[PDB]
């Protein structure tokens, strides 16, 4: 897209309609004349444009008004409203920009932010941007959260988020102009190498991959056309539905074989009854012949009844001889259909054991995408976020993705090694109780108007609680927490001196021996310029490899690498790191997934703020004090960095609306 309309797309907004968010802030305009709506919409789009075409400096209102032209720049307050809305909700002036207008010296309101992951940082910056006092508490000794980056020498490798899934409408695009991110494209070609150590032939690679994709459409057919979403009172998972679809394809192959051989027997029983009719004719013929030659041995001259007998037997014999010839033609035909039918047998199997093992790798890949065994994914809803995919090539961050949180963290009050341990919220304010991670006795009290929780869903899921809510979270929140899925994914970083692989191959697969171990070290990454191969552990394997030592895990990768490249080309790696995200207590998993029994509505539930009860009974209903952000809170973009970031931007606009007031809604 191009021009002002392109800016609307790059902001994930329709250019030609107003969103529900805007209807709420401009109910005068949406309810009014369709002409003013187009005025507004252009005003929005052209301001978005200005910010987007240069996002390294703040976009002040005056500056927006100057570039705006008549008749659009007539109504000066419409433009002030629009600009203030976009600024509040982080559509413009978000990220890392230089200010024209320096911060007002006195802050209003105090917010405590739990966690300095991306969602935390993104709100903290917005809130400071808005003139609030913001402090972040972080259990770790570092910012970034699940954006982790390994650094030793010139070795650089992300243990967490590593890919920018396309810049078309991605807010990370804006961030990439603001931070020096070395964004390197991904060559999507991936050679499968089976457990022996040798490629899968392009014949077989392609048709398994095509069956994989067909098996997916099939589950969708089961889901949306046949409403196969509940079985024995339990919601159907994706893995179940895949089994059902495979079985029914194995059943169909057997059914085809039966109907084929069954029309062989039908036609070899026509043959049977044809032969019987031909024995019983060849015997009549062998006999009438005898009768005819006997009636001929009576030498002439003979009386007419003797003459009639020779003629009668001759006529009868030639008659029976014509029948037996017609039957021989019929036997030849049917004798040919058996030859063709035997020569055209249908497929023997649906998938061979070698073929199913390749299919297993395409499932391991899909388990990696969703960080969970396919038996946990909701069949109905697991892909509900595909319609907001970004356009363009996926990319990696060659200088390490930690470069982004660190950039955001600049200029913010961040207490590291501070483990929040209780959250108290009441009608009159909040106190957060944290301890020092090094000496847990030393104890801290923070008091604030509002808490913004960005604890990972895995932490919120922990029983017994790692963080206590006072008062307890309502049932509707805790139940969303149990319903949602929090998956696991792990990475092994292998450091080498010499590229000993195909350097124009970014990634290459290894096919496992079993269904069970399909995700154990099934994919390898060279994206970095340096000699760094990076190996994935997905599906059921992830949870189990965490109870295995790094040396054994590095051992298995060396063995897999040795088979694909030869036992001589694999040197011992210098530095080895093995992530164990489920065991990390500041994560307790990798990222969220739409569990069977969950839906996208649970992601919205997670985003709802909590409002405490009145301190004095009969006092007026109070303000919400507890707010939530993070990847598990953004329905349309879960389990991604851009999603966490957008969720931070969202709450900071909501908290500000509550404590500073929305003056742009009039």
């Amino acid at each position: 897209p191009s021009g002002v309309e392109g800016a609307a797309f790059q902001s994930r907004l329709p250019h030609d309609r107003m969103t529900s968010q805007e209807a709420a802030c401009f109910p005068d305009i949406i309810s009014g004349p369709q002409q003013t709506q187009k005025v507004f919409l252009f005003i929005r789009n052209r301001t978005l444009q200005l910010w987007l075409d240069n996002p390294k400096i703040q976009l002040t209102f005056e500056a927006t008004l100057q570039q705006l032209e008549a008749p659009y720049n007539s109504d000066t307050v419409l433009v002030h409203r629009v600009h203030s809305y976009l600024e509040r909700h982080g559509l413009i002036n978000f990220g890392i920009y230089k200010r024209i207008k320096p911060l007002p010296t006195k802050k209003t309101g105090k917010v405590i932010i739990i966690g300095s992951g991306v969602s935390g940082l993104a709100a903290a910056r917005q809130l400071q941007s808005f003139g609030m006092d913001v402090t972040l508490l972080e259990a770790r000794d570092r910012v970034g959260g699940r954006v982790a980056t390994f650094r030793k020498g010139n070795y650089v490798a992300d243990l967490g988020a590593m890919v920018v899934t396309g810049l078309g409408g991605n807010p990370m695009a804006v961030v990439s102009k603001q931070v020096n991110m070395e964004l390197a494209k991904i060559k999507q070609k991936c050679p499968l190498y089976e457990a022996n150590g040798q490629a899968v032939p392009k014949e077989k690679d392609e048709m398994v991959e095509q069956e994989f994709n067909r098996l997916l459409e099939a589950t969708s057919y089961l889901s949306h056309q046949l409403d196969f979403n509940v079985l024995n009172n339990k919601p159907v998972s994706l893995g179940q539905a895949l089994e059902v679809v495979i079985q029914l394809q194995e059943k169909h192959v057997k059914d085809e074989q039966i109907e084929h051989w069954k029309k062989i027997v039908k036609t070899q029983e026509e043959l049977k009854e044809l032969l019987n009719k031909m024995v019983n004719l060849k015997e009549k013929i062998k006999e009438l012949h005898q009768q005819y030659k006997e009636a001929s041995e009576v030498k002439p001259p003979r009386d007419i009844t003797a003459e009639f007998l020779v003629k009668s037997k001759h006529r009868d014999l030639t008659a029976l001889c014509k029948e037996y010839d017609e039957l021989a033609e019929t036997q030849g035909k049917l004798e040919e259909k058996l030859q063709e039918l035997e020569a055209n047998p249908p497929s023997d199997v649906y998938l061979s054991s070698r073929d199913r093992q390749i299919l297993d790798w395409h499932f391991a890949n899909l388990e990696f995408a969703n960080a969970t065994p396919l038996s946990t994914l909701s069949l109905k809803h697991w892909d509900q976020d595909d319609d907001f995919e970004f356009t363009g090539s996926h990319l990696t961050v060659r200088n390490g993705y930690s470069c982004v949180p660190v950039a955001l963290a600049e200029g913010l009050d961040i207490k590291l090694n501070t483990a929040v341990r209780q959250v108290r919220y009441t009608a009159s304010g909040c106190e957060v109780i944290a301890v020092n991670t090094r000496s847990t006795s030393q104890t801290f009290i923070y008091k604030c108007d509002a808490v913004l929780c960005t604890l990972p869903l895995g932490v919120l899921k922990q029983q017994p609680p790692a963080v206590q809510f006072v008062p307890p979270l309502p049932e509707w929140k805790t139940s969303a927490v149990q319903r949602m899925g929090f998956g696991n994914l792990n990475k092994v970083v292998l450091c080498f001196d010499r590229v000993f692989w195909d350097p124009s191959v970014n990634l290459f697969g290894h096919v496992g021996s079993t269904t069970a171990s399909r995700g154990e070290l099934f994919l390898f990454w060279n994206l970095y310029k340096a000699p760094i191969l990076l190996a994935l552990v997905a599906g059921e394997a992830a949870g189990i490899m965490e109870n295995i030592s790094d040396d054994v895990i590095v051992g298995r990768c060396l063995a897999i690498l040795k088979g694909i490249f030869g036992s001589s080309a694999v040197p011992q790696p210098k530095e080895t790191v093995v992530s164990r995200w489920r065991a990390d207590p500041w994560a307790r998993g990798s990222y969220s997934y739409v569990a069977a029994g969950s839906s996208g509505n649970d992601y919205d539930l997670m985003a709802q703020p909590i409002t405490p009860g009145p301190s004095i009974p009969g006092a007026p209903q109070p303000i919400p004090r507890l707010f939530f952000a993070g990847e598990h809170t953004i329905r349309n973009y879960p389990a991604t960095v851009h999603g966490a970031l957008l969720s931070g931007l969202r709450e900071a606009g909501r908290i500000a609306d509550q404590f500073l007031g929305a003056m742009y809604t009039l």
């Binding site: 079985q247 059943k251 032969l275 009639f308 009668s312």
Partner: protein, 133 residues
């Protein structure tokens, strides 16, 4: 709104294979067994038909009579009248067979013959005798 080409998924099928914990394994086994059931029934009608084929060694080659190439006359010899009557008591109304017996008479004169000599050769009585057999 239609399943992918090559995939076979109807409503009817699916409860059949989900109806219990191993209803899938059972359903595949019945087809797997019924598939041997029919392969042997093929071997066994191969064998039956292989024997029947051997009994037909040489067909009917030794039992064939050369072709009588005979120009079709119009006059009825006293002989040919007599073959005729006899053909009727043996064949009834099958004029094609009757012509083949006489040899040099076509089916139409065979028809004309029934009407023409109907009273002198009691053609009516002969057919009644043929009917009771």
């Amino acid at each position: 709104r239609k399943p992918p080409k090559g995939m076979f998924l109807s409503q009817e099928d699916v409860e059949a294979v989900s109806a219990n914990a191993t209803a899938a394994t059972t359903v595949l086994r019945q087809l797997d067994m019924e598939l041997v059931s029919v392969k042997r029934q093929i071997q066994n009608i191969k064998q039956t038909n292989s024997a029947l084929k051997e009994k037909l060694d040489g067909g009917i080659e030794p039992y064939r009579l050369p072709e009588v190439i005979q120009k079709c006359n119009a006059r009825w010899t006293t002989e040919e009248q007599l073959l005729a009557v006899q053909a009727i008591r043996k064949y009834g109304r099958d004029f094609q067979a009757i012509s083949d017996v006489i040899g040099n008479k076509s089916v139409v004169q065979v028809k004309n013959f029934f009407v023409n000599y109907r009273r002198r050769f009691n053609i009516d009585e002969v057919l009644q005798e043929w009917e009771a057999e």
